[PDB]
Amino acid sequence: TLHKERRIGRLSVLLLLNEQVEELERDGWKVCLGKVGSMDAHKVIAAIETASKKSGVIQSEGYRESHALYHATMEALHGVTRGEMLLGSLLRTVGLRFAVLRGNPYESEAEGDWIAVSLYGTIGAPIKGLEHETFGVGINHI
Amino acid sequence: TLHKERRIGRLSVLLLLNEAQVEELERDGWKVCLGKVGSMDAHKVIAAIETASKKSGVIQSEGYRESHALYHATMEALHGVTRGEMLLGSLLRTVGLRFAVLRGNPYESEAEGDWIAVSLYGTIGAPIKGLEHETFGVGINHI
Amino acid sequence: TLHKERRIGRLSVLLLLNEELERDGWKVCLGKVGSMDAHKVIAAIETASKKSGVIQSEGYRESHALYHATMEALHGVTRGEMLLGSLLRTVGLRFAVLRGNPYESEAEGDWIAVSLYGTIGAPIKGLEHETFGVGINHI
Amino acid sequence: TLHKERRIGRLSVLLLLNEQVEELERDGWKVCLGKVGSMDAHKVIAAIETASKKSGVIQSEGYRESHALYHATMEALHGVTRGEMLLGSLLRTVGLRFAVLRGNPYESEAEGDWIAVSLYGTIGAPIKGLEHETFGVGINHI
Amino acid sequence: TLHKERRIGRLSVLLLLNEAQVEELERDGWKVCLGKVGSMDAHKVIAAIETASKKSGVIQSEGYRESHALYHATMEALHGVTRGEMLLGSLLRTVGLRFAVLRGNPYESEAEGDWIAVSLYGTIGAPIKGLEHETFGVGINHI
Amino acid sequence: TLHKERRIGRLSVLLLLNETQVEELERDGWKVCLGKVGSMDAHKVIAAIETASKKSGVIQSEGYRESHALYHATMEALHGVTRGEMLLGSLLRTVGLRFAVLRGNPYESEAEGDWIAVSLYGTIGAPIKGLEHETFGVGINHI
Ligand SMILES: N[C@@H](Cc1c[nH]c[nH+]1)C(=O)O
Ligand SMILES: N[C@@H](Cc1c[nH]c[nH+]1)C(=O)O
Ligand SMILES: N[C@@H](Cc1c[nH]c[nH+]1)C(=O)O
Ligand SMILES: N[C@@H](Cc1c[nH]c[nH+]1)C(=O)O
Ligand SMILES: N[C@@H](Cc1c[nH]c[nH+]1)C(=O)O
Ligand SMILES: N[C@@H](Cc1c[nH]c[nH+]1)C(=O)O
Ligand SMILES: [Zn+2]
Ligand SMILES: [Zn+2]
Ligand SMILES: [Zn+2]
Ligand SMILES: [Zn+2]
Ligand SMILES: [Zn+2]
Ligand SMILES: [Zn+2]
C-alpha cells in the first residue's frame, strides 16, 4: 500500500485547506497551487492543465503525462459536479482553489509517479452569496 | 454568506484526515459523529452512516425530514468516492472508509437554519491486498 | 404533430393517478410491483404487457421497444443512478403501459408509453416520498 | 406518512395535466404554473426559479429555499432528460409547462414544508412536430 | 438471434475500419451510408449523421418514426466515444470521426422488421495539434 | 500524433471482429491477448479480462500501476457496451462478450511509452439469451 504519513490525497487536501508548499517540496512532491472561477468546466480543465505544466508538475511535451492529468481532473470534477459535469449550462458556477501533487505514494519504487488533483471552494448561483461548499479529489498513475 | 470561521465542509474534512478532537467542535455549536465502514456494497456505507448519525443524535431517530437530507447528503458524497458509477463490488472494487457527519449553521445569517455535511475518506481498489488509491467525498444539504 | 386529444403520455399518467381508452385506439395495461430490485420492476412490466396484448410475446422488436421505454421511465424514478436496494432505497409502484398512435400522421404508427407511479424511500413505510417517470418509444 | 388526500406529487401532476381554478391555494399549498420553451437547460431552471420567486412560492431572500427548489428542479429534469441533462447541446428542444407546489404532505406537522417540481410537455428536434412527450417530477424537503 | 455474415453491428464497424464493400452490402439488402465529421460540439455530430442519413435514403426524410430511431442509435454510439459525460468542447475536447449508418434485418425471423446501426470511429483529445488517442462507438436501434 | 498503420484501437478491433493473426501482431511490438466471457455481472467481465491479461504477458502481475491502467481502460470500454448505466443483471440484461487487449506504443516518439486498449465485442440482451442485439466498447489508457 501507501505510506502512513505520505498519502498523496490526504496531503493535497490538508494543504488546500490550510493557507505548506515548502515542507512538501523537500520530499519528492512536485506541488502546484491554483484558483479558478468559471461557469464553464472546459475553463476549469484548461486552468489546471496550464498551472500544471507552468509549475514543475507535468512535462509540457507529449500526450502521456497530459492524458494522466485530464482523467485525474474529470475524476475530481465528480465530487464537485455530483452527477452531471455541468456548471453554467445548469445555471451554477464555481469558486475553486485547486491543489495538485505528483510523487510516489507507495512503498516500492516500481510504482512510479502518481498524480493527485484536489479541488475546494464553493458552488452556487451566478449571484455571489448564493452558494455552499464543493469538493473533488482525483487520483491517477502518471 | 459562508462565514470563514465556520466552513462546514472544511471543518468536517479536517476532522476526518487528522489522526489526533471532536470535543472542540461540539463547543462551537456543532453536532458531530464519526465512524468506519469497509465494504463492497455502497448500501452498507449508506446504512452505517444513517445508523451512526441517529444513535449519536446528529439527526432524529424518528420522522423523515432529517433522514431525507442525510440520505441526499450521503448520496452526494458517494459521488466523490465513486466518480461516475456509484458501484463497488458489482464493478469489482471495494472501499475502506472513515466518515464524518457535521451539523450546524455555516452561513452569517442565522435565519439560514442548519445544514448537514457528510465526508468520506479512505481507499478504493481491487479486492486483492493493497491494490488501491485514496478516495474522498463530501456532500452538503440543508437540514 | 401530436394530436392534442390523444397524447399517449398524458393519458397513461392520468390513468395512474385515478382510482375506456380501449374503445379508442389504445392498447392498455396496468400493474403493481414493489421492489428493492430494478430488474424486477423491469420484469414485472414486461410480463404484464405480454400476458395482455400490449406487446407481442414473440421476437425482439417489440420487446426491445418496451425495454428502452421502461429504462427511460426508470430515469424519472431513480434521478441519477438507476439503483434501488443497491443504494438502500426501495419502491412501491403502479405502472401503466399504453400503445397506439398519438400523431395526426397515421403514418407514424404505434408508439409506446411506460408510466411509473408510487413511492421511493427507505424499507420503512412513511420514510419515503413520491416518485414518477414516463418513457416514450416507437414500436 | 403520505396521506392519500394530500399527495403533493400527485396533486402537482394532476393540476399541470388539466385545463385555472385554484383551490389548492384553499388548503395550505403555495403554487405556480408556467410555460417555457428552450434549447437551454439553464433557461428552464431559471424560468422555474423566477416563476416561484415572482409569486410567493419560495422566498427571494436567502439560500435555503433557493437550494431546495434548485435540487427539486434538477431531479425533475432527470425525468425529462433521461441520462444526459443536455438539450440543444445534444440537438434537442423542449416545450414545457410546469407547476411547483409547496406544503406539508405528511400527517405529522413536524415534517415541515416540502416542494415538488413537475414538468410536462414535449421534447423533440428543433422543428416542431418531430417530438414526443416528456415528464419530470422532483420532490425535496424545504 | 443474429446470423454470422449479417451481424449488422460488426459489418458496420468493419466497414469503417478498412480504408479500402459498400456495394457488396447493398446487393445483400443493406441500406447504408458513410460519412466523416469533425467537431467540438456533440450536436454537430448528430446533425451530420441525421442529414447524411436522410439525403442518402437510409431513413425517411418525412415523419418522426425513423428520425426517432436514428436519434437514439446515435445517442447510444456517442456513449462509447464520450465514456461518461456526453460533452466534447464543453469539457475541453474535440473529435475526428468517420461514421457508418446501416439498415436492414439481422434476423432469420423477417417479422423483426428493419433495425439500424450507427458506428463511429476517429480520435479524441485536446483542441491542440496532436494530443489525442483513438475513440469508438456503436449504437443499435429498431427502425 | 500516431503512426497510421499501428493504430492500437483499430488493430485490436480488426483483431477482435475476425474469428495466427495474433502472431503477426506479436511479431511487431505488440503484447496481445484474446478471450471470451459471458455474464450478468460486470465484475466477472472485468475479472476475466484482468486474469487473461495477467496469465499472458500483457500486464505485470505484481503491483498496482499496471492494474490501475487495465482497470480503467476496461471501465472505459464497458461505457460503450452499457450506454449510460454500467449495469447488466441489475437492469435485467446480460452480455456474451469477446475481448481483445493490446499493449504497445502507437505514437510518434518512444518517449510516449506503452498504452493499452481494451476492446469489447458481442451481444447484450434479456436474461433469456437469443433476444439480443450487438455491443461494442473501446477503452484506451496509458500504461
Ligand atoms: N447553482 C446551484 C449550486 C449547487 C447546489 N448544489 C450543487 N450545486 C445553486 O444555485 O445553488
Ligand atoms: N477495482 C478497481 C478499483 C478502482 C481503481 N480506481 C478506481 N477504482 C481497481 O482495480 O483498483
Ligand atoms: N433512501 C431514500 C430514498 C430516496 C429519497 N429520494 C430518492 N430516493 C429515502 O430513504 O428516502
Ligand atoms: N432531439 C430528439 C429529441 C428526443 C427524443 N428523445 C429524447 N429527446 C429528436 O430529434 O427527436
Ligand atoms: N482533454 C483530453 C481529452 C480526453 C482524454 N480522454 C478522454 N478525453 C485530452 O487531452 O486528450
Ligand atoms: N434487457 C435488454 C438488454 C438491452 C437491449 N439494449 C440494451 N440493452 C433486452 O431485453 O434486450
Ligand atoms: Zn483518454
Ligand atoms: Zn446543493
Ligand atoms: Zn437496445
Ligand atoms: Zn429524495
Ligand atoms: Zn425519444
Ligand atoms: Zn483509479
PDB file of N, CA, C and O in Angstrom, chain E residues 70-118:
ATOM      1  N   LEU E  70     -33.173   6.898 -35.331  1.00  0.00           N
ATOM      2  CA  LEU E  70     -31.836   7.402 -35.649  1.00  0.00           C
ATOM      3  C   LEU E  70     -31.244   8.171 -34.503  1.00  0.00           C
ATOM      4  O   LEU E  70     -30.031   8.160 -34.273  1.00  0.00           O
ATOM      5  N   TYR E  71     -32.102   8.886 -33.800  1.00  0.00           N
ATOM      6  CA  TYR E  71     -31.559   9.827 -32.889  1.00  0.00           C
ATOM      7  C   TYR E  71     -30.966   8.968 -31.778  1.00  0.00           C
ATOM      8  O   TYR E  71     -29.793   9.123 -31.414  1.00  0.00           O
ATOM      9  N   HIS E  72     -31.769   8.001 -31.309  1.00  0.00           N
ATOM     10  CA  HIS E  72     -31.403   7.176 -30.170  1.00  0.00           C
ATOM     11  C   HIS E  72     -30.222   6.240 -30.434  1.00  0.00           C
ATOM     12  O   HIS E  72     -29.339   6.057 -29.586  1.00  0.00           O
ATOM     13  N   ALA E  73     -30.161   5.685 -31.643  1.00  0.00           N
ATOM     14  CA  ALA E  73     -28.978   4.910 -32.040  1.00  0.00           C
ATOM     15  C   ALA E  73     -27.707   5.781 -32.070  1.00  0.00           C
ATOM     16  O   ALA E  73     -26.636   5.302 -31.751  1.00  0.00           O
ATOM     17  N   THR E  74     -27.837   7.070 -32.376  1.00  0.00           N
ATOM     18  CA  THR E  74     -26.684   7.941 -32.385  1.00  0.00           C
ATOM     19  C   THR E  74     -26.325   8.227 -30.950  1.00  0.00           C
ATOM     20  O   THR E  74     -25.152   8.185 -30.560  1.00  0.00           O
ATOM     21  N   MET E  75     -27.350   8.504 -30.161  1.00  0.00           N
ATOM     22  CA  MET E  75     -27.205   8.776 -28.730  1.00  0.00           C
ATOM     23  C   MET E  75     -26.330   7.677 -28.086  1.00  0.00           C
ATOM     24  O   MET E  75     -25.313   7.941 -27.441  1.00  0.00           O
ATOM     25  N   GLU E  76     -26.707   6.436 -28.358  1.00  0.00           N
ATOM     26  CA  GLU E  76     -26.025   5.256 -27.856  1.00  0.00           C
ATOM     27  C   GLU E  76     -24.547   5.195 -28.271  1.00  0.00           C
ATOM     28  O   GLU E  76     -23.667   5.075 -27.414  1.00  0.00           O
ATOM     29  N   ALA E  77     -24.295   5.305 -29.574  1.00  0.00           N
ATOM     30  CA  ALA E  77     -22.951   5.302 -30.127  1.00  0.00           C
ATOM     31  C   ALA E  77     -22.060   6.373 -29.492  1.00  0.00           C
ATOM     32  O   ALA E  77     -20.874   6.169 -29.304  1.00  0.00           O
ATOM     33  N   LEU E  78     -22.629   7.510 -29.134  1.00  0.00           N
ATOM     34  CA  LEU E  78     -21.840   8.584 -28.545  1.00  0.00           C
ATOM     35  C   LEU E  78     -21.372   8.268 -27.120  1.00  0.00           C
ATOM     36  O   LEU E  78     -20.452   8.901 -26.636  1.00  0.00           O
ATOM     37  N   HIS E  79     -21.995   7.310 -26.441  1.00  0.00           N
ATOM     38  CA  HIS E  79     -21.500   6.922 -25.113  1.00  0.00           C
ATOM     39  C   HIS E  79     -20.119   6.327 -25.167  1.00  0.00           C
ATOM     40  O   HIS E  79     -19.252   6.662 -24.365  1.00  0.00           O
ATOM     41  N   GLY E  80     -19.901   5.428 -26.125  1.00  0.00           N
ATOM     42  CA  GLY E  80     -18.578   4.839 -26.339  1.00  0.00           C
ATOM     43  C   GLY E  80     -17.508   5.886 -26.602  1.00  0.00           C
ATOM     44  O   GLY E  80     -16.392   5.763 -26.118  1.00  0.00           O
ATOM     45  N   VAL E  81     -17.857   6.915 -27.376  1.00  0.00           N
ATOM     46  CA  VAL E  81     -16.935   7.985 -27.735  1.00  0.00           C
ATOM     47  C   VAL E  81     -16.688   8.793 -26.503  1.00  0.00           C
ATOM     48  O   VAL E  81     -15.549   9.152 -26.203  1.00  0.00           O
ATOM     49  N   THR E  82     -17.756   9.067 -25.771  1.00  0.00           N
ATOM     50  CA  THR E  82     -17.673  10.077 -24.745  1.00  0.00           C
ATOM     51  C   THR E  82     -17.443   9.519 -23.337  1.00  0.00           C
ATOM     52  O   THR E  82     -17.006  10.256 -22.460  1.00  0.00           O
ATOM     53  N   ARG E  83     -17.692   8.217 -23.134  1.00  0.00           N
ATOM     54  CA  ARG E  83     -17.269   7.493 -21.905  1.00  0.00           C
ATOM     55  C   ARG E  83     -17.575   8.190 -20.564  1.00  0.00           C
ATOM     56  O   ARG E  83     -16.690   8.285 -19.699  1.00  0.00           O
ATOM     57  N   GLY E  84     -18.814   8.666 -20.378  1.00  0.00           N
ATOM     58  CA  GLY E  84     -19.253   9.126 -19.038  1.00  0.00           C
ATOM     59  C   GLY E  84     -20.110  10.381 -18.995  1.00  0.00           C
ATOM     60  O   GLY E  84     -21.218  10.380 -18.445  1.00  0.00           O
ATOM     61  N   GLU E  85     -19.569  11.440 -19.587  1.00  0.00           N
ATOM     62  CA  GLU E  85     -20.220  12.703 -19.779  1.00  0.00           C
ATOM     63  C   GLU E  85     -20.305  12.971 -21.289  1.00  0.00           C
ATOM     64  O   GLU E  85     -19.321  12.837 -22.002  1.00  0.00           O
ATOM     65  N   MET E  86     -21.489  13.297 -21.793  1.00  0.00           N
ATOM     66  CA  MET E  86     -21.678  13.375 -23.246  1.00  0.00           C
ATOM     67  C   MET E  86     -21.354  14.743 -23.820  1.00  0.00           C
ATOM     68  O   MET E  86     -22.032  15.248 -24.712  1.00  0.00           O
ATOM     69  N   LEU E  87     -20.278  15.316 -23.293  1.00  0.00           N
ATOM     70  CA  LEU E  87     -19.779  16.622 -23.676  1.00  0.00           C
ATOM     71  C   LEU E  87     -18.485  16.488 -24.524  1.00  0.00           C
ATOM     72  O   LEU E  87     -17.733  15.543 -24.350  1.00  0.00           O
ATOM     73  N   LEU E  88     -18.235  17.412 -25.453  1.00  0.00           N
ATOM     74  CA  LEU E  88     -16.942  17.438 -26.143  1.00  0.00           C
ATOM     75  C   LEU E  88     -16.262  18.730 -25.767  1.00  0.00           C
ATOM     76  O   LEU E  88     -15.569  18.793 -24.749  1.00  0.00           O
ATOM     77  N   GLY E  89     -16.503  19.776 -26.554  1.00  0.00           N
ATOM     78  CA  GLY E  89     -15.896  21.076 -26.309  1.00  0.00           C
ATOM     79  C   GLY E  89     -16.158  21.578 -24.902  1.00  0.00           C
ATOM     80  O   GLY E  89     -15.272  22.167 -24.267  1.00  0.00           O
ATOM     81  N   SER E  90     -17.367  21.342 -24.396  1.00  0.00           N
ATOM     82  CA  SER E  90     -17.730  21.948 -23.117  1.00  0.00           C
ATOM     83  C   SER E  90     -16.982  21.269 -21.957  1.00  0.00           C
ATOM     84  O   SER E  90     -16.992  21.742 -20.815  1.00  0.00           O
ATOM     85  N   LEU E  91     -16.264  20.202 -22.314  1.00  0.00           N
ATOM     86  CA  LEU E  91     -15.344  19.537 -21.406  1.00  0.00           C
ATOM     87  C   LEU E  91     -13.924  19.491 -21.957  1.00  0.00           C
ATOM     88  O   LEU E  91     -13.156  18.569 -21.631  1.00  0.00           O
ATOM     89  N   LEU E  92     -13.586  20.499 -22.769  1.00  0.00           N
ATOM     90  CA  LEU E  92     -12.231  20.717 -23.305  1.00  0.00           C
ATOM     91  C   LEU E  92     -11.740  19.553 -24.174  1.00  0.00           C
ATOM     92  O   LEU E  92     -10.666  19.019 -23.979  1.00  0.00           O
ATOM     93  N   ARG E  93     -12.527  19.151 -25.145  1.00  0.00           N
ATOM     94  CA  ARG E  93     -12.059  18.109 -26.050  1.00  0.00           C
ATOM     95  C   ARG E  93     -12.829  18.114 -27.366  1.00  0.00           C
ATOM     96  O   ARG E  93     -13.933  18.649 -27.447  1.00  0.00           O
ATOM     97  N   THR E  94     -12.255  17.486 -28.383  1.00  0.00           N
ATOM     98  CA  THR E  94     -12.770  17.581 -29.740  1.00  0.00           C
ATOM     99  C   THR E  94     -12.580  16.253 -30.513  1.00  0.00           C
ATOM    100  O   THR E  94     -11.860  15.361 -30.059  1.00  0.00           O
ATOM    101  N   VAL E  95     -13.254  16.088 -31.652  1.00  0.00           N
ATOM    102  CA  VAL E  95     -13.286  14.768 -32.315  1.00  0.00           C
ATOM    103  C   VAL E  95     -13.111  14.787 -33.852  1.00  0.00           C
ATOM    104  O   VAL E  95     -13.472  15.744 -34.522  1.00  0.00           O
ATOM    105  N   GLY E  96     -12.546  13.712 -34.386  1.00  0.00           N
ATOM    106  CA  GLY E  96     -12.467  13.487 -35.818  1.00  0.00           C
ATOM    107  C   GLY E  96     -13.034  12.109 -36.016  1.00  0.00           C
ATOM    108  O   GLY E  96     -12.501  11.164 -35.459  1.00  0.00           O
ATOM    109  N   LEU E  97     -14.145  12.006 -36.738  1.00  0.00           N
ATOM    110  CA  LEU E  97     -14.861  10.737 -36.899  1.00  0.00           C
ATOM    111  C   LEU E  97     -15.330  10.483 -38.320  1.00  0.00           C
ATOM    112  O   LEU E  97     -15.788  11.389 -39.019  1.00  0.00           O
ATOM    113  N   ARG E  98     -15.199   9.231 -38.726  1.00  0.00           N
ATOM    114  CA  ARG E  98     -15.955   8.689 -39.823  1.00  0.00           C
ATOM    115  C   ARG E  98     -17.178   8.066 -39.164  1.00  0.00           C
ATOM    116  O   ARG E  98     -17.109   7.642 -38.004  1.00  0.00           O
ATOM    117  N   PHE E  99     -18.293   8.016 -39.886  1.00  0.00           N
ATOM    118  CA  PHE E  99     -19.446   7.283 -39.382  1.00  0.00           C
ATOM    119  C   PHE E  99     -20.077   6.422 -40.439  1.00  0.00           C
ATOM    120  O   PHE E  99     -20.019   6.736 -41.619  1.00  0.00           O
ATOM    121  N   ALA E 100     -20.642   5.307 -40.014  1.00  0.00           N
ATOM    122  CA  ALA E 100     -21.418   4.486 -40.903  1.00  0.00           C
ATOM    123  C   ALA E 100     -22.788   4.266 -40.300  1.00  0.00           C
ATOM    124  O   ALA E 100     -22.901   4.080 -39.077  1.00  0.00           O
ATOM    125  N   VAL E 101     -23.812   4.283 -41.162  1.00  0.00           N
ATOM    126  CA  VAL E 101     -25.175   4.003 -40.750  1.00  0.00           C
ATOM    127  C   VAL E 101     -25.778   2.883 -41.598  1.00  0.00           C
ATOM    128  O   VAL E 101     -25.900   3.015 -42.814  1.00  0.00           O
ATOM    129  N   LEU E 102     -26.192   1.789 -40.959  1.00  0.00           N
ATOM    130  CA  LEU E 102     -26.668   0.609 -41.696  1.00  0.00           C
ATOM    131  C   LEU E 102     -28.132   0.242 -41.397  1.00  0.00           C
ATOM    132  O   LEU E 102     -28.565   0.353 -40.258  1.00  0.00           O
ATOM    133  N   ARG E 103     -28.886  -0.210 -42.400  1.00  0.00           N
ATOM    134  CA  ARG E 103     -30.291  -0.563 -42.184  1.00  0.00           C
ATOM    135  C   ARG E 103     -30.672  -1.840 -42.893  1.00  0.00           C
ATOM    136  O   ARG E 103     -30.304  -2.049 -44.042  1.00  0.00           O
ATOM    137  N   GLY E 104     -31.453  -2.671 -42.220  1.00  0.00           N
ATOM    138  CA  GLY E 104     -31.916  -3.951 -42.772  1.00  0.00           C
ATOM    139  C   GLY E 104     -32.248  -4.869 -41.609  1.00  0.00           C
ATOM    140  O   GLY E 104     -32.219  -4.435 -40.455  1.00  0.00           O
ATOM    141  N   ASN E 105     -32.549  -6.134 -41.887  1.00  0.00           N
ATOM    142  CA  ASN E 105     -32.971  -7.060 -40.829  1.00  0.00           C
ATOM    143  C   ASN E 105     -31.917  -8.145 -40.528  1.00  0.00           C
ATOM    144  O   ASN E 105     -31.698  -9.015 -41.356  1.00  0.00           O
ATOM    145  N   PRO E 106     -31.263  -8.094 -39.337  1.00  0.00           N
ATOM    146  CA  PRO E 106     -30.217  -9.066 -38.961  1.00  0.00           C
ATOM    147  C   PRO E 106     -30.755 -10.384 -38.359  1.00  0.00           C
ATOM    148  O   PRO E 106     -30.055 -11.083 -37.609  1.00  0.00           O
ATOM    149  N   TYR E 107     -31.981 -10.729 -38.716  1.00  0.00           N
ATOM    150  CA  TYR E 107     -32.643 -11.874 -38.130  1.00  0.00           C
ATOM    151  C   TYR E 107     -33.237 -12.780 -39.210  1.00  0.00           C
ATOM    152  O   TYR E 107     -33.688 -12.291 -40.259  1.00  0.00           O
ATOM    153  N   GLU E 108     -33.204 -14.095 -38.948  1.00  0.00           N
ATOM    154  CA  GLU E 108     -33.937 -15.099 -39.729  1.00  0.00           C
ATOM    155  C   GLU E 108     -35.395 -14.681 -39.823  1.00  0.00           C
ATOM    156  O   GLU E 108     -35.954 -14.537 -40.913  1.00  0.00           O
ATOM    157  N   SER E 109     -35.975 -14.482 -38.641  1.00  0.00           N
ATOM    158  CA  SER E 109     -37.347 -14.050 -38.429  1.00  0.00           C
ATOM    159  C   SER E 109     -37.511 -12.723 -39.174  1.00  0.00           C
ATOM    160  O   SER E 109     -36.881 -11.735 -38.810  1.00  0.00           O
ATOM    161  N   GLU E 110     -38.344 -12.689 -40.215  1.00  0.00           N
ATOM    162  CA  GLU E 110     -38.394 -11.489 -41.051  1.00  0.00           C
ATOM    163  C   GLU E 110     -39.419 -10.531 -40.487  1.00  0.00           C
ATOM    164  O   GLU E 110     -39.433  -9.354 -40.863  1.00  0.00           O
ATOM    165  N   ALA E 111     -40.241 -11.030 -39.562  1.00  0.00           N
ATOM    166  CA  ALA E 111     -41.142 -10.188 -38.770  1.00  0.00           C
ATOM    167  C   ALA E 111     -40.431  -9.262 -37.754  1.00  0.00           C
ATOM    168  O   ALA E 111     -41.090  -8.496 -37.046  1.00  0.00           O
ATOM    169  N   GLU E 112     -39.099  -9.309 -37.678  1.00  0.00           N
ATOM    170  CA  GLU E 112     -38.368  -8.368 -36.811  1.00  0.00           C
ATOM    171  C   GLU E 112     -38.359  -6.939 -37.376  1.00  0.00           C
ATOM    172  O   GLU E 112     -38.116  -5.960 -36.642  1.00  0.00           O
ATOM    173  N   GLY E 113     -38.644  -6.833 -38.675  1.00  0.00           N
ATOM    174  CA  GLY E 113     -38.622  -5.562 -39.382  1.00  0.00           C
ATOM    175  C   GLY E 113     -37.196  -5.108 -39.536  1.00  0.00           C
ATOM    176  O   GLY E 113     -36.269  -5.882 -39.309  1.00  0.00           O
ATOM    177  N   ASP E 114     -37.030  -3.841 -39.912  1.00  0.00           N
ATOM    178  CA  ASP E 114     -35.713  -3.217 -40.048  1.00  0.00           C
ATOM    179  C   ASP E 114     -35.175  -2.803 -38.692  1.00  0.00           C
ATOM    180  O   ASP E 114     -35.932  -2.449 -37.777  1.00  0.00           O
ATOM    181  N   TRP E 115     -33.852  -2.813 -38.612  1.00  0.00           N
ATOM    182  CA  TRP E 115     -33.076  -2.386 -37.471  1.00  0.00           C
ATOM    183  C   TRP E 115     -32.080  -1.453 -38.022  1.00  0.00           C
ATOM    184  O   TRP E 115     -31.889  -1.387 -39.238  1.00  0.00           O
ATOM    185  N   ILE E 116     -31.402  -0.732 -37.144  1.00  0.00           N
ATOM    186  CA  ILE E 116     -30.452   0.283 -37.591  1.00  0.00           C
ATOM    187  C   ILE E 116     -29.180   0.290 -36.725  1.00  0.00           C
ATOM    188  O   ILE E 116     -29.240   0.120 -35.500  1.00  0.00           O
ATOM    189  N   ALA E 117     -28.029   0.455 -37.375  1.00  0.00           N
ATOM    190  CA  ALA E 117     -26.755   0.580 -36.668  1.00  0.00           C
ATOM    191  C   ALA E 117     -26.070   1.869 -37.047  1.00  0.00           C
ATOM    192  O   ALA E 117     -26.182   2.323 -38.171  1.00  0.00           O
ATOM    193  N   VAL E 118     -25.404   2.475 -36.071  1.00  0.00           N
ATOM    194  CA  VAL E 118     -24.653   3.688 -36.242  1.00  0.00           C
ATOM    195  C   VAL E 118     -23.328   3.373 -35.616  1.00  0.00           C
ATOM    196  O   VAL E 118     -23.282   3.140 -34.409  1.00  0.00           O
TER     197      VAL E 118
END
